[PDB]
């Protein structure tokens, strides 16, 4: 253990967290890899969704190479604070955090190569603008846009580590009201005034199930229409009876149109 | 480990700087000594509303930017690029509103502790009526038309015409109450 400690100290000695790998040189290829744990919520009212995931990043920092040892080194999470990590953020998140119990949920695994594996367990609530025109026979496209905050394409490059197989857990997602019909991974470079940055987009397509609405909207409406039509089977002399059928069904229809509109934005 | 301006948002209620995966702040240095300090921020800022013309109203929401401790003797502010200093007004997508215009202003405001620099970003929000024609106006308009059906019944149908009267009167108060419940 003492030898390993000494080697780690030597690796740290003169390590500047302020400088990326190949500081002046070519950009750092960062490999992204996601394992989805769950989508906990989808709010049409706030037009967001809450996602929980394992966000893994792979890059190479030559300053963390070790020749002597023949095995990969898993170090305590607190090493992250004394290493350079990519400034990766989620463009369309509203509120995100990294789980803290029992320890901060972050993993560092080193390789003699100098390759770093930086895993984080994250829950994001990200914006998902919704086209409710076809509601509730609609479907939506929610995304998670991944980008670097400060480093341009001159300093950072992104790629989905394993291409189409870079994301896992779409199969684990269990939502009461939706179902994930497909997902897509994309890699792009977007241009801001401050420069051109790398971006990766994870996408889902959510098909809404109708079960909830046939119970809470459609049947009430359909039966309130049928109820109104009972007044046709009373003789015209039953004036008060047929006005009750008319008025009540008319009023209970406005309150449905209002109460149905209350669960939406 | 650097000096940064003590810039705050005068009319914010609760703001934060995003932290995932790393704190969302960028520093870019130039050999000149020029610093570019970027922050990704979400603020919820106060926007006093004149609901007199509601829901055919429009509002003026602002974001007042000022330095907390340093006076005009120590700090000056300017919109870098003048009218082109703000971007993304075009990206804004609100279900109930639409941004008709925006304005940038530069002022120096005077407190008891001294004169401080201020920049004001302003939006003008025009409310769409779609939501209210569905949830208020049509119910009201149809509840009025419903009351007028009782005119087409002979006067001898006393109970029928009282139902039309009472129900329409009561469903009108509950609209006036329920409509007032979504407002301050």
């Amino acid at each position, epitope marked *: 253990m003492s030898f390993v400690k000494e080697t780690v100290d030597k690796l740290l000695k003169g390590y500047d967290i302020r400088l990326r790998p190949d500081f002046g040189g070519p950009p750092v290829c960062v490999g992204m890899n996601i394992d989805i744990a769950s989508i906990d919520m989808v709010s049409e009212v706030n037009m967001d969704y809450t996602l929980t995931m394992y966000f893994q990043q792979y890059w190479r920092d030559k300053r963390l190479a070790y020749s002597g040892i023949p095995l990969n080194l898993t170090l305590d999470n607190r090493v992250a604070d004394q290493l350079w990590v990519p400034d990766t953020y989620f463009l369309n998140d509203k509120k995100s955090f990294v789980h803290g119990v029992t320890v901060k949920n972050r993993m560092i695994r080193l390789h003699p190569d100098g390759t770093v594996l930086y895993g984080l367990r994250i829950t994001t609530t990200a914006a998902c*603008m919704m086209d409710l025109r076809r509601y509730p026979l609609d479907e939506q496209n929610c995304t998670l846009e991944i980008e670097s905050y400060g480093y341009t394409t001159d300093d950072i490059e992104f790629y989905w580590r394993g291409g189409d197989k870079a994301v896992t857990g779409v199969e684990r997602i269990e939502l009461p009201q939706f179902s994930i019909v497909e997902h897509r991974l994309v890699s792009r470079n*977007v*241009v801001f005034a401050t420069g051109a940055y790398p971006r990766l987009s994870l996408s889902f397509r959510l098909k809404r199930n109708i079960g909830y609405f046939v119970i809470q909207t459609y049947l009430p409406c359909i039966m309130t229409v049928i109820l109104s039509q009972v007044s046709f089977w009373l003789n015209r002399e039953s004036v008060p009876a047929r006005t009750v059928f008319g008025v009540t069904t008319v009023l209970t229809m406005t309150t449905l149109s209002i109460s149905a509109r209350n669960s939406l934005p | 480990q650097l000096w940064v301006p003590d810039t705050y948002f005068l009319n914010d209620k609760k703001s934060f700087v995003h932290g995932v995966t790393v704190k969302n702040r960028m520093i870019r240095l130039h050999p000149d000594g020029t610093v570019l300090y970027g922050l990704r921020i979400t603020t919820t800022a106060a926007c006093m509303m004149d609901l007199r013309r509601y829901p055919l109203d429009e509002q003026n929401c602002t974001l007042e930017i000022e330095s907390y401790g340093y006076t005009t003797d120590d700090i000056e502010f300017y919109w870098r690029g003048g009218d082109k200093a703000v971007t993304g007004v*075009e990206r*804004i997508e609100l279900p109930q509103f*639409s941004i008709v215009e925006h304005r940038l202003v530069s002022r120096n405001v005077v407190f008891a502790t001294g004169a401080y620099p201020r920049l004001s970003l302003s939006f003008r929000l025009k409310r769409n009526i779609g939501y209210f024609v569905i949830q208020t106006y049509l119910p009201c308009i149809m509840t009025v038309i419903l009351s007028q059906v009782s005119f087409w019944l002979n006067r001898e149908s006393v109970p029928a015409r009282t139902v039309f009267g009472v129900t329409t009167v009561l469903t009108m108060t509950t609209l006036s109450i329920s409509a007032r419940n979504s407002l301050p």
Partner: nanobody
Amino acid sequence: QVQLQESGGGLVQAGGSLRLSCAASGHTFNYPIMGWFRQAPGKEREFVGAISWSGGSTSYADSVKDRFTISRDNAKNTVYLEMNNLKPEDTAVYYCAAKGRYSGGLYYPTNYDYWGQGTQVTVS
């Protein structure tokens, strides 16, 4: 996907006016922002202006500012470009482009995913 088709380009005399149209079809909601670019024979692609999904907020280039107006009509999935007091400097092929919700800056052509085969505008 999205398909954009333009119209209204033609020959106009200096100081004249003209209205270009751009009809969109397909997933118009996923690409809410619309932009106008023009390409002169010699010069590089120039940003003209752009409009929001709501249609309220716009943005124009300085050269084109005060003489052009961009409008929207989501009822017909169409954006319009009214060009008044036209100069011979305005002569170009005018393109219509659609931008993704999170695509970065308006000014840059790279960000726009879908374009339409442009219409020619000549000013004598």
